[PDB]
Scaffold this active site. Structure first.
Site, PDB file in Angstrom:
ATOM      1  CG  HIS A  30     -24.810 -52.609 -35.568  1.00  0.00           C
ATOM      2  ND1 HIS A  30     -25.475 -52.274 -36.696  1.00  0.00           N
ATOM      3  CD2 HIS A  30     -24.936 -51.568 -34.602  1.00  0.00           C
ATOM      4  CE1 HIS A  30     -25.979 -51.007 -36.166  1.00  0.00           C
ATOM      5  NE2 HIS A  30     -25.813 -50.686 -34.946  1.00  0.00           N
ATOM      6  CD  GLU A  54     -24.914 -53.931 -30.979  1.00  0.00           C
ATOM      7  OE1 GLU A  54     -25.174 -53.080 -31.168  1.00  0.00           O
ATOM      8  OE2 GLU A  54     -25.502 -55.099 -31.417  1.00  0.00           O
ATOM      9  CB  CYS A 139     -24.865 -47.349 -35.466  1.00  0.00           C
ATOM     10  SG  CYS A 139     -26.690 -47.717 -34.971  1.00  0.00           S
TER      11      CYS A 139
END
Length: 172
Positions: A30, A54, A139
């Site tokens: 992402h 992910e 992230c």
């Protein structure tokens, strides 16, 4: 953690990624910017791209970070392992966050469905503040643990619950 580790955490799209080896890089799907032509100079089509959930894993055709020695990458940690989430922030703060690693699991978070190895931050009662816990921009920061004398990479941070403590390490 050592500086040899922290220098492996570079920016990548809207978060971060991590040089496991000169050739091998991990990040969150992402955070990857949409339809770039190129990553670290190299054109997309010459990179071997692997994705599971992910978790994203680039292997480059030539060495890129000749400075780093190759690490051990595993498909998560044993359940109960206390790992460190190695957060970098834009202004260069280093924030090693301790996390007890749980089992593989699925949650609805940040309006979407995520899986990976779940974990709880050992940082406070309610790590909602970015002083104590993760923020969306973290992230792709890596989860590591020390197994005797080796450092082991288990994957990357891909999501956090509203509670502050519960977190997902994308794996494989």
């Amino acid at each position: 953690a050592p500086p040899s580790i922290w220098s492996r955490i570079v920016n990548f799209g809207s978060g971060w990624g991590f040089w496991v080896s000169p050739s091998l890089f991990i990040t969150s799907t992402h955070v990857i910017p949409q339809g770039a032509k190129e990553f670290f100079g190299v054109p997309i089509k010459q990179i071997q791209i692997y994705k599971s959930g992910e978790f994203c894993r680039l292997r480059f055709p030539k060495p890129i970070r000749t400075d780093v020695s190759g690490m051990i990458l595993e498909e998560g940690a044993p359940e109960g392992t206390v790992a460190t989430l190695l957060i970098k922030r834009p202004t260069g703060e280093l924030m090693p966050l301790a996390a007890r690693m749980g089992t593989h699991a699925t949650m609805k978070i940040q309006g979407r469905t995520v899986g990976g190895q779940m974990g709880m931050l050992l940082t406070g009662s309610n790590a909602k503040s970015m002083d104590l816990g993760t923020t969306p921009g973290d992230c792709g920061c890596p989860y590591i643990y020390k197994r005797g004398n080796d450092y082991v990479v288990i994957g990357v941070h891909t999501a956090a619950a509203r509670g502050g403590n519960t977190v997902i390490c994308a794996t494989q």
